[PDB]
Amino acid sequence: EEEEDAGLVAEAEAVAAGWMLDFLCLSLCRAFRDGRSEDFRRTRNSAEAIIHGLSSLTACQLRTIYICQFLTRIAAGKTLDAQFENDERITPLESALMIWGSIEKEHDKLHEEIQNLIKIQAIAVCMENGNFKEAEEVFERIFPFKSKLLMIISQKDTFHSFFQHFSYNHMMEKIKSYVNYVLSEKSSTFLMKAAAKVVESKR
Amino acid sequence: EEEEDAGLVAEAEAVAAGWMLDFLCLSLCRAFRDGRSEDFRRTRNSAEAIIHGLSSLTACQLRTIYICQFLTRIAAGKTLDAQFENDERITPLESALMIWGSIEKEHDKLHEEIQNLIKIQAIAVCMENGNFKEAEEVFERIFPFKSKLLMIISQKDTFHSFFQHFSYNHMMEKIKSYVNYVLSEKSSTFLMKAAAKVVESKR
Ligand SMILES: O=S(=O)(O)c1ccc(OCc2ccccc2)c2ccccc12
Numbered sequence: 001e002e003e004e005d006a007g008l009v010a011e012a013e014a015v016a017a018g019w020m021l022d023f024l025c026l027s028l029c030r031a032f033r034d035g036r037s038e039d040f041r042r043t044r045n046s047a048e049a050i051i052h053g054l055s056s057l058t059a060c061q062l063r064t065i066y067i068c069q070f071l072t073r074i075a076a077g078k079t080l081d082a083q084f085e086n087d088e089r090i091t092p093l094e095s096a097l098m099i100w101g102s103i104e105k106e107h108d109k110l111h112e113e114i115q116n117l118i119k120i121q122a123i124a125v126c127m128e129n130g131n132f133k134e135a136e137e138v139f140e141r142i143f144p145f146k147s148k149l150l151m152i153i154s155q156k157d158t159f160h161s162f163f164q165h166f167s168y169n170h171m172m173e174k175i176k177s178y179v180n181y182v183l184s185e186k187s188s189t190f191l192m193k194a195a196a197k198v199v200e201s202k203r
Numbered sequence: 204e205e206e207e208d209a210g211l212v213a214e215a216e217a218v219a220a221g222w223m224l225d226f227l228c229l230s231l232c233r234a235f236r237d238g239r240s241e242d243f244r245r246t247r248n249s250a251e252a253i254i255h256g257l258s259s260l261t262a263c264q265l266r267t268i269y270i271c272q273f274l275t276r277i278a279a280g281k282t283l284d285a286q287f288e289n290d291e292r293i294t295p296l297e298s299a300l301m302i303w304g305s306i307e308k309e310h311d312k313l314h315e316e317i318q319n320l321i322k323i324q325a326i327a328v329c330m331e332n333g334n335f336k337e338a339e340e341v342f343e344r345i346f347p348f349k350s351k352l353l354m355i356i357s358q359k360d361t362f363h364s365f366f367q368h369f370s371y372n373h374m375m376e377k378i379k380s381y382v383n384y385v386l387s388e389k390s391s392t393f394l395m396k397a398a399a400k401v402v403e404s405k406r
């Protein structure tokens with residue numbers, strides 16, 4: 001009887017952890033979208049700790065976790081001292097690109113635009129730091145679009161017009177648009193819905 | 204309108220964080236009680252991260268947080284290399300004793316027994332590590348019961364019978380009994396109740 005009670009408790013804790021993960025992911029996407037970067041930092045710490053206390057994950061929760069990891073690496077995209085992979089040469093934007101091409105999601109025009117913007121910026125942030133050999137290394141791992149980028153790396157022109165047309169802000173805004181579609185999908189999660197009900201009843 | 208929507212969202216996130224804090228505290232007390240120390244470690248990481256994302260706390264939630272901090276220091280009671288206070292001389296059991304005498308709770312016989320057991324053990328764990336000068340330092344900060352303890356410190360008798368009568372296990376068991384009263388009080392929290400309902404409907 002006491003083994004079954006402990007079992008019911010563990011099952012209930014697994015249900016609550018799954019709800020908390022969904023809420024933390026929604027909150028992280030919202031923070032990314034609003035540019036509230038301190039909230040994104042704190043919520044990322046919370047989502048990571050919650051995931052370490054989970055054992056089973058549904059496919060939707062794994063997809064959810066991958067999106068949160070992508071956003072974390074995009075936010076750390078200019079932080080070339082961040083190591084997101086066991087391979088220490090993989091820059092944050094290269095790490096986000098690997099997740100982007102691995103999430104089970106539709107490959108619509110927005111998916112491709114974000115992918116191409118991340119590739120250009122993975123190079124541009126190396127040029128911006130003066131790491132011209134590292135931009136060349138990044139380029140060989142990611143790659144007509146290709147020939148212009150290699151030309152820029154060899155010419156060492158960091159503030160090239162191409163990097164302004166396909167800028168970091170353009171990349172962020174397109175990722176924000178995608179995040180808006182994800183934010184609408186599960187603004188319908190249990191914790192968020194129940195919290196919203198409480199708020200609306202106190203008005 | 205968009206400022207009010209952001210406001211409603213922040214209020215709802217504050218309601219959800221408050222529910223998650225309550226659930227994590229219940230889960231931490233349960234882990235302490237069952238002696239599932241890896242779960243206690245992981246859940247303590249989760250409760251800390253959640254609290255860093257909260258701004259307002261009700262009195263009941265502060266009391267709740269204090270109990271969780273006490274349990275963490277009791278579990279780290281034999282870890283003399285743990286620093287829980289800005290004063291680096293305060294040992295984990297001395298740190299738990301300060302919280303125990305600071306929680307707004309009834310001072311029943313169990314409260315006093317736990318207090319006296321923590322005081323004896325704050326000394327005993329220094330003797331067990333061979334830190335006889337540090338046991339003397341701990342003794343002066345905490346303190347007929349007093350004269351026996353000072354006699355033991357000066358006699359350097361680490362494996363004294365007094366430390367077996369008022370042992371670490373006796374201290375843990377009495378704290379576990381208290382934790383059982385706390386665990387029954389808010390096994391009634393929102394997240395836990397709703398998770399239990401889902402589990403019972405899938406049986
Ligand atoms: O900062 S990172 O991108 O590196 C990051 C790491 C781990 C995380 O969760 C633990 C984990 C989930 C899945 C597989 C294995 C570990 C993250 C959850 C959300 C957001 C970011 C996360």
Ligand SMILES: O=S(=O)(O)c1ccc(OCc2ccccc2)c2ccccc12
Nearest residue numbers: 247250251254255268271272275276287
């Ligand atoms: O490991 S410790 O005991 O040091 C500890 C520290 C901080 C914590 O939360 C952050 C915090 C809450 C209240 C005031 C300021 C900070 C803890 C929450 C639960 C359990 C333990 C915690």
Ligand SMILES: [Ca+2]
Nearest residue numbers: 080081082088
């Ligand atoms: Ca680097």
Ligand SMILES: [Ca+2]
Nearest residue numbers: 102103104105
């Ligand atoms: Ca596929």
Ligand SMILES: [Ca+2]
Nearest residue numbers: 283284285291
């Ligand atoms: Ca020490």
Ligand SMILES: [Ca+2]
Nearest residue numbers: 305306307308
């Ligand atoms: Ca008082």
